[PDB]
Amino acid sequence: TRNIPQVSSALFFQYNQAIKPPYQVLIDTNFINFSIQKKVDIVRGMMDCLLAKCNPLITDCVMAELEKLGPKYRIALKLARDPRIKRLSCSHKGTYADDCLVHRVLQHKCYIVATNDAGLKQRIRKIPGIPLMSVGGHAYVIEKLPDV
């Protein structure tokens, strides 16, 4: 049987009419490390960027990557385990976090992706209706979000 995935009902052509405040943001492993480098708080940095409440989310793969980083990145692991950060369970074998984030946004058009990886950003940009958040300069920056 052939499969052609249905276009999400949350998309009006290139405009995602589902992502509205308060936002849900998927955190990538590099995002926390860069955030510590720039002295940017995760919760407040996002609130300043979007002028709204943001609900950060960490998947099992990203949590796994943080634990594998080592004692050098102890601060990142402590911030990632802040109770305000909710957790997302994973039901797939691989621990590769890049594919996990890409598959989640394909399934549901309700997440912002927070990452600085050039490879991952390029993939997300090809997916329509996915706002992309990054840390650049002194604070966060959001690309594909009309309400800003």
């Binding site: 009006f12 052509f13 290139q14 405009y15 995602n16 009419q17 209706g129 594909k144 979000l145 009309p146 309400d147 800003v148």
Partner: peptide, 15 residues
């Protein structure tokens, strides 16, 4: 706006 030419922004304005 910051970047008027975002396709998502144009579609949102259309709607």
């Amino acid at each position: 706006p910051k970047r008027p030419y975002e396709s998502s922004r144009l579609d949102a304005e259309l709607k």
